[PDB]
Design a protein around this ligand. Structure first.
Ligand code: POO
Ligand code: MN
Ligand code: MN
Length: 512
């Protein structure tokens, strides 16, 4: 059946958008191009590999016990900036246990227990994301009302935060920090006698997810030891929200129908991950890949295995891709075999090497600096909820490009404007922090270790990538950034106390 049906009505904005300040942002104006790409008929033929894998997943999920969150708990874990409800309350009311929000949530819950059929309304919107130079359309976000989003947490928060790591073990990508991800990948690579690996990424993964996939996910969740009420709500949520439902735009008009994965529900990330893991493990078996190890974050997959030779590997990946296509998930680009860990890119990121103070080799996670640089450029002009600059400084703090350019530029703009002690909002790992720039040294030490302030002798490929990137975007080269940073460091050190600590740790690399 069709991933989507459309009525004719447009996907409309809810606010003042802006598609430029080179660097652009996606808007609702481009939503029609996205609608085209994500609209198609799915075909799926399962086989005994798929079935054998699923059976093993269920046997693991059957050892998981999960509880209901109370309304109260679910209210307290609602994110502070999520969309206000149609029925008269917002995120802030939910979190402060307003009687209006609580009585309406209890009523949504009771309706889920009592009605297991009526499709549930979702709003469709175009996501506003900054990119770099061609132009890609806006991604679509599809979410139900806030009261339903609280009930999803009641039914499933304990399941989605416990089950996946038990079912997928070390392949569950979301349990790792960047350093931990690197350690998994490097250890896996070094365990093979002749390592080969590849990344796979599915072409419109949300749209490839079928009704059967979503029902299979529910059946995994029902292997858990759950309270009766939980089982009924999870079934009712599966039938009324997860498999499909109607879409309505920001102006309350009927946009169409969805018969595929919603991007804006609690189970999206866990479901996608479980479903990809299931099809990818089955596809490794069809392909007959030797000593296979997988890392999965949504539909981003790395596989690392024993090479069987050059032409053998190339053919084996074709058989893998064929199997994945039969299971409903063709790739955006065909996967390529790699014999260098550094060349495998997934979740937009890759492993690279540098040296610590003692001269020990140290592996760290990096990425192409183009999009992060563009995004930080945008937040120099405008101002966001997410502060992607700061998040990137935190997650990629050991990288050459974050230390030399991102850290430098932003502590300079902060000295200039005297905003050192002003806290900034910052979305990292699905949660919104209030970050004080002088807190960074401690945050980076906690996330990456002290070696992050001390790494040198980076790999020549990484240095050249940063350098080509600066040149392509019009930003000063690295010699300029070393000079500026000597200046920024000097100032911070004059300011004493905590700002002196920033200068000492964050810019120790600039000293002569
Ligand atoms: C004539 N030339 C210099 C003045 C204005 C400039 C406009 N451009 C292309 C930029 O500003 C590019 N750019 C950009 C930039 C612009 C667009 C996309 C990506 C980076 C940045 C970002 C780098 C990372 C921190 C955030 C600013 C930037 C920083 C400093 C400087 C600088 O010249 O000192 C330039 C930077 C063009
Ligand atoms: Mn994809
Ligand atoms: Mn992906």
């Amino acid at each position: 059946s069709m991933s989507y049906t459309w009525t004719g009505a447009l996907i409309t904005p809810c606010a003042a958008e802006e598609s430029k300040l080179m660097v652009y942002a996606t808007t609702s104006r481009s939503a029609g191009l996205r609608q085209k790409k994500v609209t198609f008929d799915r075909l799926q033929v399962l086989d005994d590999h798929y079935r054998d894998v699923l059976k093993e997943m269920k046997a693991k999920a059957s050892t998981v016990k999960a509880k209901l969150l109370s309304v109260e708990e679910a209210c307290k874990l609602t994110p502070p900036h999520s969309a206000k409800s149609k029925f008269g309350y917002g995120a802030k009311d939910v979190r402060n246990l307003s009687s209006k929000a609580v009585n309406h949530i209890h009523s949504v819950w009771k309706d889920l227990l009592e009605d297991t059929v009526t499709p549930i309304d979702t709003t469709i919107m175009a996501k506003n994301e900054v990119f770099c130079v061609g132009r890609k359309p806006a991604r679509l976000i599809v979410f139900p009302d806030l009261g339903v989003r609280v009930c999803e947490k009641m039914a499933l928060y304990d399941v989605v935060s416990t089950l996946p790591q038990v079912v997928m073990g070390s392949s569950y990508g979301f349990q790792y920090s960047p350093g931990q991800r690197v350690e998994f990948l490097v250890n896996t690579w070094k365990s093979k006698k002749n390592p080969m690996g590849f990344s796979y990424d599915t072409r419109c993964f949300d749209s490839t997810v079928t009704e059967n996939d979503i029902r299979v996910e529910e059946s995994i969740y029902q292997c858990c030891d759950l309270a009766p009420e939980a089982r009924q709500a999870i079934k009712s949520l599966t039938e009324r929200l997860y498999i499909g439902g109607p879409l309505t735009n920001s102006k309350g008009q009927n946009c169409g129908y969805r018969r595929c994965r919603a991007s804006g529900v609690l189970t999206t990330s866990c479901g996608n991950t479980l479903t990809c893991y299931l099809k990818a493990s089955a596809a490794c078996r069809a392909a007959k890949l030797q000593d296979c190890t997988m890392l999965v974050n949504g539909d981003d997959l790395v596989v690392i295995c024993e090479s069987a030779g050059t032409q053998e590997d190339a053919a084996s990946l074709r058989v893998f891709t064929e199997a994945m296509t039969r299971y409903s998930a063709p790739p955006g680009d065909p996967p390529q075999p790699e014999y260098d860990l550094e060349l495998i890119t997934s979740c937009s990121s890759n492993v690279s090497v540098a040296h610590d103070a003692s001269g020990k080799r140290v592996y760290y996670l990096t990425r192409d600096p183009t999009t992060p640089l563009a995004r930080a450029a945008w937040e120099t002009a405008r101002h966001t909820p997410v502060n992607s600059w700061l998040g990137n400084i935190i997650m990629y703090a050991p990288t050459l490009w974050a230390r030399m350019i991102l850290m430098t530029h932003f502590f300079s703009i902060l000295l200039a404007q005297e905003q050192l002690e002003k806290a900034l909002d910052c979305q990292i790992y699905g949660a919104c922090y209030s970050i004080e720039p002088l807190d960074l040294p401690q945050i980076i030490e906690r996330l990456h270790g002290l070696s992050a302030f001390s790494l040198h002798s980076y790999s020549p490929g990484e240095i050249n990538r940063v350098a080509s990137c600066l040149r392509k975007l019009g930003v000063p080269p690295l010699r300029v950034w070393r000079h500026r940073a000597r200046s920024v460091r000097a100032r911070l050190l004059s300011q004493g106390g905590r700002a002196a600590t920033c200068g000492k740790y964050l810019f120790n690399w600039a000293v002569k």
